[PDB]
Structures are given as structure tokens and as C-alpha cells.
Amino acid sequence: RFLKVKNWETDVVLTDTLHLKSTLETGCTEHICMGSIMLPSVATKDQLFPLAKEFLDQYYSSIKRFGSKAHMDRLEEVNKEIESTSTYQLKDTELIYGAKHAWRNASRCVGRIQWSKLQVFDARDCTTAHGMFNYICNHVKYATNKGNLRSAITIFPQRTDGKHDFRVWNSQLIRYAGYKQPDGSTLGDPANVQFTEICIQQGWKAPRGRFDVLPLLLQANGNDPELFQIPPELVLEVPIRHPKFDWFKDLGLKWYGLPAVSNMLLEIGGLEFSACPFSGWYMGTEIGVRDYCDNSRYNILEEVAKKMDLDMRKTSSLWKDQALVEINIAVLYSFQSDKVTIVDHHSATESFIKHMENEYRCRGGCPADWVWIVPPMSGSITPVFHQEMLNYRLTPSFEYQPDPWNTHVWKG
Amino acid sequence: RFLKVKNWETDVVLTDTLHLKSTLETGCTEHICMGSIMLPSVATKDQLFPLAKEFLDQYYSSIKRFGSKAHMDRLEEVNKEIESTSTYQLKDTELIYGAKHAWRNASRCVGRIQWSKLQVFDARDCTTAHGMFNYICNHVKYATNKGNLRSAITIFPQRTDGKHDFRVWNSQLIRYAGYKQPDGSTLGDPANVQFTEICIQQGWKAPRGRFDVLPLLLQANGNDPELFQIPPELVLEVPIRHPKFDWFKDLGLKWYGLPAVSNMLLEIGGLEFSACPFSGWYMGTEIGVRDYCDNSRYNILEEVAKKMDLDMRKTSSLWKDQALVEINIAVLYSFQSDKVTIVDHHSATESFIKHMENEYRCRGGCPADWVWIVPPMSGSITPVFHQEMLNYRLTPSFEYQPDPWNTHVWKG
Numbered sequence: 001r002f003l004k005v006k007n008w009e010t011d012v013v014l015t016d017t018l019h020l021k022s023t024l025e026t027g028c029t030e031h032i033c034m035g036s037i038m039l040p041s042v043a044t045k046d047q048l049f050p051l052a053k054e055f056l057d058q059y060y061s062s063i064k065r066f067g068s069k070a071h072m073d074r075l076e077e078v079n080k081e082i083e084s085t086s087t088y089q090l091k092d093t094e095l096i097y098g099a100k101h102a103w104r105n106a107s108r109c110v111g112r113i114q115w116s117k118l119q120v121f122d123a124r125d126c127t128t129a130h131g132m133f134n135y136i137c138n139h140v141k142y143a144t145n146k147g148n149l150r151s152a153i154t155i156f157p158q159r160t161d162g163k164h165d166f167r168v169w170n171s172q173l174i175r176y177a178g179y180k181q182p183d184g185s186t187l188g189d190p191a192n193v194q195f196t197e198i199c200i201q202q203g204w205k206a207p208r209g210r211f212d213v214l215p216l217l218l219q220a221n222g223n224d225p226e227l228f229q230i231p232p233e234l235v236l237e238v239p240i241r242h243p244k245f246d247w248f249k250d251l252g253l254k255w256y257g258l259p260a261v262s263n264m265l266l267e268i269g270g271l272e273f274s275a276c277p278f279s280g281w282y283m284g285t286e287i288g289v290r291d292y293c294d295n296s297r298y299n300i301l302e303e304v305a306k307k308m309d310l311d312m313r314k315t316s317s318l319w320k321d322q323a324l325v326e327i328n329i330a331v332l333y334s335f336q337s338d339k340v341t342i343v344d345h346h347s348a349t350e351s352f353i354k355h356m357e358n359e360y361r362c363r364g365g366c367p368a369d370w371v372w373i374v375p376p377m378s379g380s381i382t383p384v385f386h387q388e389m390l391n392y393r394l395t396p397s398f399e400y401q402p403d404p405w406n407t408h409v410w411k412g
Numbered sequence: 413r414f415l416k417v418k419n420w421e422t423d424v425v426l427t428d429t430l431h432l433k434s435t436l437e438t439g440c441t442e443h444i445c446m447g448s449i450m451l452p453s454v455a456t457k458d459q460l461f462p463l464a465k466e467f468l469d470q471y472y473s474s475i476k477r478f479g480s481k482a483h484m485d486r487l488e489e490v491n492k493e494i495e496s497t498s499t500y501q502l503k504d505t506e507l508i509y510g511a512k513h514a515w516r517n518a519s520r521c522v523g524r525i526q527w528s529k530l531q532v533f534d535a536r537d538c539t540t541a542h543g544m545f546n547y548i549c550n551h552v553k554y555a556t557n558k559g560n561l562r563s564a565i566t567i568f569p570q571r572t573d574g575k576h577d578f579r580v581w582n583s584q585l586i587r588y589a590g591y592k593q594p595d596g597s598t599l600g601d602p603a604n605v606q607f608t609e610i611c612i613q614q615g616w617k618a619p620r621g622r623f624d625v626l627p628l629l630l631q632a633n634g635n636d637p638e639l640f641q642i643p644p645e646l647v648l649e650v651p652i653r654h655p656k657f658d659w660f661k662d663l664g665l666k667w668y669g670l671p672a673v674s675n676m677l678l679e680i681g682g683l684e685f686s687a688c689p690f691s692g693w694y695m696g697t698e699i700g701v702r703d704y705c706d707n708s709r710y711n712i713l714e715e716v717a718k719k720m721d722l723d724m725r726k727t728s729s730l731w732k733d734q735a736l737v738e739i740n741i742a743v744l745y746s747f748q749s750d751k752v753t754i755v756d757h758h759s760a761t762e763s764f765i766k767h768m769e770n771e772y773r774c775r776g777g778c779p780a781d782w783v784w785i786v787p788p789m790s791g792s793i794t795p796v797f798h799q800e801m802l803n804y805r806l807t808p809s810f811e812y813q814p815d816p817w818n819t820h821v822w823k824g
């Protein structure tokens with residue numbers, strides 16, 4: 001009822017009572033743990049008021065006005081609108097709070113120390129794909145800030161019936177294209193091969209190369225989605241060089257500066273915002289470890305080992321590890337030498353322990369997913385490897401949602 | 413009821429029904445996941461027969477003689493002895509099966525592909541600490557095999573009342589001593605500083621240096637424990653050199669060849685073997701990452717960075733990662749160049765995926781702890797990082813148990 005999490009590198013103990021406020025299910029049971037499952041798993045007017053009530057109760061209990069006059073009137077105000085319209089609308093202030101807390105509660109996010117410095121763009125007045133394009137361009141511009149990156153989210157109209165959903169079909173506003181070849185192999189980013197072919201299917205003219213920035217596929221009010229090309233002046237790219245190995249430029253790699261996920265659902269007081277792209281800045285390992293070295297991604301460990309004069313015969317020469325560190329030194333150096341915001345996994349994971357300490361004190365806990373918080377390289381030399389973490393689902397929250405092309409009743 | 417685990421680097425799917433046989437609790441609930449908690453948490457004659465029955469039912473269902481003549485008579489035989497003595501004794505064959513399956517079910521073990529090749533030493537006729545010493549010496553000798561290491565376990569008499577417990581007080585048969593200094597800092601292994609001082613308290617004469625092999629503290633039949641020094645000819649050590657950096661010998665490091673954990677409890681058909689040291693061989697990262705580079709262990713990343721000509725000012729130079737790979741190339745090379753069995757974390761984690769495939773087919777599942785299976789360096793370039801894993805508690809099993817000095821009613 002008052003659970004303890006320990007750090008085993010520092011012997012520091014924190015006490016979690018925030019998990020008592022938790023509401024949703026985790027997938028684990030008393031007899032099975034599913035903490036390594038990647039994705040474990042239309043609303044009515046009945047379930048909607050407890051969700052509004054619960055949300056409004058914590059919003060007013062956060063501006064030091066819990067149960068007060070304005071809280072009880074807002075409670076009644078929302079109840080009235082949920083009777084009237086079987087839904088309701090959030091105040092601008094409630095939308096900013098909810099969004100910030102969906103990030104605050106993202107247990108898989110190592111970057112949450114910044115959760116309160118989040119710029120919320122209210123795009124709930126949007127109606128067309130072009131409007132979405134415009135809103136997304138201002139999001140990208142703003143969040144990029146000429147390389148001094150700034151956290152932001154853009155919130156398109158909430159789901160209503162379910163057939164009039166706003167969706168960004170891209171998993172991220174800025175992704176490189178992936179193209180399969182005659183010999184089967186993949187140019188560009190293999191992760192996006194399916195989406196890259198959907199864009200061609202909708203009329204995209206592919207410059208079938210490596211780091212081709214994909215177009216946006218924006219669906220408005222449940223209408224069929226439409227392609228828009230982000231002006232390349234808004235797409236900030238960092239070419240990757242090493243601070244020792246001058247052959248590293250010959251590798252000819254680069255990555256975009258702005259990680260901006262667009263395929264997730266924002267949940268606030270029972271309301272579902274099916275299109276809510278949010279962006280921060282990269283932790284280096286996302287690019288250099290996962291993007292560049294996953295077998296099913298850019299898979300460059302082959303070449304980087306070669307040009308380093310590496311023992312590639314034996315598995316036990318650790319040529320894979322050795323090339324992996326060099327790649328991440330290079331990504332970090334390249335981003336910093338261009339004044340493009342980036343964080344290394346030591347600084348990011350120390351920041352998170354520090355953030356974890358703040359939440360357990362002023363909030364009673366911090367939902368955290370160890371499987372996702374520990375970086376994908378050098379796990380145990382970072383402080384989070386040794387940090388016991390309680391995972392649990394608080395709301396407001398970001399939730400996974402299916403790709404739109406599996407669910408969208410087409411017509412055109 | 414028939415849960416699916418996915419690999420996301422290979423898209424391979426397996427179906428787990430073995431978890432249905434699971435019995436014990438995990439610590440997780442429907443509303444909280446505790447998969448990153450390190451340690452989540454006298455018997456009677458009532459609970460003992462379901463446990464015997466369940467065990468015997470799976471033992472005879474494994475020699476293709478389930479429910480047959482000899483099974484029903486053994487069932488009755490054990491029932492009779494549990495009425496008579498309120499406990500029972502395992503057959504030699506049942507002890508070997510149970511031990512092998514406690515390993516097979518160790519969800520935190522990446523080395524389980526070898527689970528059936530386990531040499532079981534029956535030491536249930538032991539009565540004195542000297543006998544335990546003798547048994548442990550033969551275990552170490554046998555398992556070391558002049559560097560061609562072999563898996564083994566030695567099983568001392570099962571718990572009876574609880575005040576007559578056999579215990580090895582060492583957490584591992586072979587550990588280096590840790591000594592605190594006048595200036596507070598630690599010579600040797602900081603993990604063992606408390607145990608090293610207990611040995612001095614019991615009369616150990618410390619050669620207060622670095623890699624001093626600790627003595628054995630053996631408790632027999634609940635009597636106060638007694639010190640014995642393993643003959644150094646039985647303690648096989650590998651001095652660590654690099655296959656490039658000749659200053660690596662100047663580091664003057666070495667590690668023992670034989671990982672042999674002795675502080676855990678083996679549970680077989682409700683019987684509790686409080687002293688059951690088991691040994692395999694090292695996966696390289698246990699030594700080079702955790703033993704050598706944990707902050708609260710040997711903590712050598714300082715020196716290894718130095719002698720490499722490394723940028724140690726900035727955190728983001730990844731000097732910690734770069735020195736970490738070199739250390740693990742060296743440990744692997746040093747062990748292999750001495751024909752001492754060792755496995756690198758790429759070969760070990762590939763073997764485990766292969767093992768995972770075997771268990772899901774011929775057994776319906778493989779309980780696995782992702783938090784512990786993924787190696788502590790280069791997580792995502794190993795196949796297990798991308799492997800969803802179901803964790804659940806099967807029996808027979810190895811369980812954690814408190815250190816004896818917190819629980820043992822002394823007298824001498």
C-alpha cells in the first residue's frame with residue numbers, strides 16, 4: 001500500500017504512494033509479468049463523467065483550488081455538457097495541464113524532467129488537411145528553433161463519433177523513406193517501407209534515395225488523407241562526422257534534429273485526441289544505436305567495423321560493440337558541433353534519477369518502465385540500470401493506437 | 413489463456429501455454445508491474461503433499477510413465493512418509509530431475525540452453541562443516557575441469573525443522589575479499605566488504621590485498637559456521653590482458669574462472685535445500701561490465717579511460733562506453749587464450765533465443781526475465797533486447813534466501 005523502490009548503486013530508497021491513484025491495467029497479473037511485451041492490451045456518455053470528474057478533481061487540486069467554488073461549478077458545467085452533447089470541451093488551461101501530465105505520466109519516457117516546459121498548441125479549431133499541414137509546419141518551425149530545440153505538442157480536434165477522426169498517418173512528422181530493391185534489400189529506412197509505399201500509392205514521387213524526408217499524410221475529420229511536403233528549410237538535418245575518424249564523413253550519414261511522434265493518442269478526462277504530434281529532442285542512442293544499428297533498420301555496423309580495422313571473423317571480438325560506441329560518439333559530436341540540442345544517455349539517465357527523486361517527494365511516485373528507460377547500450381554504467389522502478393498507468397496519458405490504414409473506412 | 417510473445421527484430425512469434433502450469437506469485441498485479449524490483453516477496457505437513465504430488469506428477473509424466481503403476485506407488489509411498497515423518501526424501505533420480513528443472517525454470521538465467529547437462533552431486537549424507545568443505549572442494553575441482561568448465565550443483569541435506577539448516581555463508585564459493593581503508597575507500601571487491609569482515613571476526617587472517625580468494629564459511633545442521641580455505645590449486649584464475657593494448661597487463665587484473673553461487677535455496681517438491689551451490693561458466697559481461705565497472709564494485713573505468721588517451725572532461729565523449737568495450741574484449745580474449753570456458757554476450761544471447769524456441773515447442777513456453785536476460789552492455793545489438801518474454805514462476809526452482817548472519821540463532 002506504500003511500496004518501496006531501491007537503487008542498488010546508491011542504496012537510495014523512495015516510497016511510492018502515487019501508484020494508489022493508478023486506474024488502468026498493466027497487462028501483468030499476480031501470476032505473470034508482461035513488462036517486456038511491447039504493446040499490451042467509441043465511448044459512451046456513462047463512463048465519461050467519472051473520467052471528467054477525476055480529471056477536473058486533480059486539475060483544481062493542482063492550482064490550489066480543490067473542491068472550491070470554481071471547481072464545483074466547472075464540475076457541474078461539464079456534467080451539463082455531457083448530458084447535453086454526450087461529450088464536452090476542455091478549457092485552454094485544462095488542455096495544457098492534461099497534455100503536460102500525459103507526458104509526466106509517460107512511464108517509458110526518460111526525458112520527463114522537462115515535462116512542465118511543454119508548449120501546447122491548440123489546433124482544436126482545425127477542419128481540413130491543409131489546416132493540419134499549416135499547424136504541423138508551425139509546430140516543426142517552433143520546436144526546432146534553429147537547433148535550440150523546444151518541447152511542443154499540437155492537439156487537433158478530439159474524437160467525436162469515431163468515423164470523423166483526425167489522424168497523422170506518419171508515425172513521426174519527420175522520417176526517412178524506405179524502399180525495397182529488386183534484390184529484396186532496403187534503401188533508406190526499413191522501418192518505413194510500408195508507409196513509404198502508401199505515399200507512393202497516394203501519388204508521392206519518390207526520389208528513391210537514402211535520407212529522403214517523407215511527406216505528411218494528414219487525415220481531417222475522418223476524410224481520406226492528403227499528402228503535403230514539409231518545406232525542406234523547416235527540416236533541420238545534422239550530417240554525422242566523427243571527431244577522430246575522418247573517413248566518417250565518407251559514410252555519408254545524417255539524421256533529422258526533431259523527434260516528433262505523431263501516431264499516438266492523447267487521453268484527457270475521457271476525451272480522445274487521435275492526432276496530437278509531440279516533439280522533444282533526441283537522446284543520442286535513439287539514432288546511433290537503434291536507428292543506425294538495429295538489424296531491421298539502417299544496419300550500418302558492417303561498414304563502421306570495416307573502416308576501423310576490426311576483427312570481424314569472431315563474434316567474441318566485440319567488433320559490434322566497438323563500432324557501436326564510435327557511432328554514438330559521432331552522432332553526439334555532430335549534433336553538438338551544430339548547436340543542435342541532443343542529450344547523451346549518461347546525462348539523460350542521470351537527469352531521470354534526479355527527476356524520479358522530485359516526483360517521489362512532491363507527488364509520491366513516478367511511473368517508470370525499466371525495460372524502456374535503460375538505454376540500449378551500456379545499460380549498467382548508467383544510473384537507471386540500478387534503479388528499481390514501479391510501472392503503472394496514470395491518466396492523462398499518451399496511448400498507442402492502430403495505424404489508420406488498417407481501420408479507416410475509405411471511400412475515395 | 414494462450415499468450416503470444418513476439419520478436420521485433422525477426423518478427424518470429426511463439427505461443428506460451430507453459431505459464432498455465434505456473435503456481436507462485438510474481439509481485440506484479442493487474443495495476444502495477446514490479447518486473448524491475450530486485451527481490452520481490454518452516455513448512456507444515458498439510459501443504460507438503462500437493463507439492464510432492466505436483467512434483468511427482470511431472471517427474472513421471474517426463475519419463476513417459478505418467479499415472480502408471482510405479483507413479484501411483486511412489487505417490488502413495490511419499491504420502492505415507494509425509495504422514496509418518498511430516499516430510500519425505502527424494503529418490504536420487506528425482507533429485508537430479510528437480511535440480512535440472514530448477515535451473516530450467518530460472519527465468520533470470522541466459523545460460524539455460526545447457527540446463528539438461530547438469531552434474532548433480534548428492535551431498536545429502538553430509539553432517540559436518542568439514543564434510544561440506546570436502547564436498548565443495550570436489551565440486552570446484554569437478555566443475556573447473558582444468559578450464560573446460562562443466563555445470564554442476566551440490567545438494568546438502570534439506571531443511572527439516574528450520575533450526576538445523578545447512579548453509580554456505582559465502583554468496584559464491586569463490587569471491588575476492590573487500591577491505592575498507594582508513595580513507596574510507598575500498599581495496600578488493602566492495603560487494604564482499606561485509607562478508608570479508610565476518611570472516612575476520614571468525615578468525616580469518618586477511619592478506620589485505622586485491623584479489624584475495626575468500627575462505628569458506630560453512631554451517632552444518634544449524635551449528636555455528638567454520639572457516640575453510642580452498643586449496644589455491646583448485647582456484648583457477650585468469651589474468652586479464654588485451655590483444656592490442658600491452659599496458660593492459662600493467663592494470664594487473666584477474667578474475668576467477670568459476671561462477672558458483674552458494675547463497676540460494678533449491679526448492680523441489682516442497683522440500684527446501686538451504687545449501688545447494690551451483691556453478692556454470694561466465695558470460696563475459698558479468699566480469700568486465702558488472703564486476704569491473706559497477707560504481708560500487710571494482711570501478712576501474714577511471715584507469716582504463718586514462719591509459720587509452722580518452723576525453724574524460726565531458727560526459728558526452730562516451731569515454732565510459734569506449735573503455736567498457738575494451739575491458740570486455742580483454743576479459744574474453746584472456747579467458748579464451750587460457751582455454752578457460754567463457755561465453756560472450758552475443759553468443760550467449762543468441763543461444764538463449766535458440767533455447768527459447770526449443771522450450772516453446774517441446775514445453776509450451778520459457779519463463780524469462782527480460783530485465784535480467786538483456787546483457788548490461790550493448791543491449792539492443794543482441795537478439796534478446798527485441799524478444800518479448802513472459803516471466804512466471806515454475807517449480808522446482810531456485811529461490812533467494814536471507815543471509816544466514818541475520819537469521820541464525822548463535823550460541824558459541
Ligand code: HEM
Pocket residue numbers: 099102103106108109110111112114118151152153278279280281282283286343348372398
Ligand atoms: C524533451 C526531450 C525528450 C527526450 C530526451 C525523450 C526521450 C525519450 C526516449 C529515449 C523514449 C524511448 C522511445 C524509444 O526508445 O523509441 C521516449 C518515449 C516517450 N516519450 Fe519522451 N522524450 C522527450 C520528450 C517528450 C515529449 C515532449 C513527450 C510528450 C509530450 C514525450 C512523450 C513520450 C512518450 C509518450 C513515450 C513512449 C511512447 C511509447 O509507449 O512508445 N517525450 N522519450
Ligand code: HEM
Pocket residue numbers: 511514515518520521522523524526530563564565690691692693694695698755760784810
Ligand atoms: C552454463 C553456464 C551459465 C551461464 C553462462 C549463466 C549465465 C547467467 C547470468 C549472466 C545470470 C545473471 C546473473 C547476474 O547478472 O549476476 C544468471 C542467473 C542465474 N543462473 Fe545462470 N548461468 C549458467 C549456469 C547456471 C547453472 C548451472 C545454474 C543452476 C543449476 C544457473 C542458475 C541461475 C539462477 C538461479 C540465476 C538467477 C538467480 C537470481 O535470481 O539472481 N545458471 N545466469
Ligand SMILES: Cc1cc(N)nc2cc(-c3ccc(CN)cc3O)c(F)cc12
Pocket residue numbers: 108259260261278279280281282283286
Ligand atoms: C517525444 C520523443 C522524444 C524522443 N527523443 N524520442 C521519442 C521516441 C518515441 C518512440 C518512437 C518509436 C517507438 C516505437 N518503436 C516508441 C517511442 O516511444 C516517442 F514516441 C517520442 C519521443
Ligand SMILES: Cc1cc(N)nc2cc(-c3ccc(CN)cc3O)c(F)cc12
Pocket residue numbers: 520671672673690691692693694695698
Ligand atoms: C550459475 C551462474 C553462472 C553465471 N555465469 N553467473 C551467475 C550469476 C548469478 C548471480 C550472481 C549475483 C546475483 C546478485 N547480484 C544474482 C545472480 O543471479 C548466479 F546466481 C548464478 C550464476
Ligand SMILES: C[C@H](O)[C@H](O)[C@H]1CNc2nc(N)[nH]c(=O)c2N1
Pocket residue numbers: 035036037038371372373420797798799800801
Ligand atoms: C521486446 C522489448 O520489449 C522491445 O524490444 C523493447 C525493449 N525496450 C525498448 N526500450 C526503448 N527505449 N525502445 C524500444 O524500442 C524498446 N524495445
Ligand SMILES: C[C@H](O)[C@H](O)[C@H]1CNc2nc(N)[nH]c(=O)c2N1
Pocket residue numbers: 008385386387388389447448449450783784785
Ligand atoms: C534495479 C534492477 O532491477 C537491477 O539493477 C537489476 C537489473 N537487471 C540485472 N540484470 C542482471 N543480469 N544482473 C543484475 O544484477 C541486474 N540488476
Ligand SMILES: [Zn+2]
Pocket residue numbers: 028032033034035440444445446447
Ligand atoms: Zn510485471
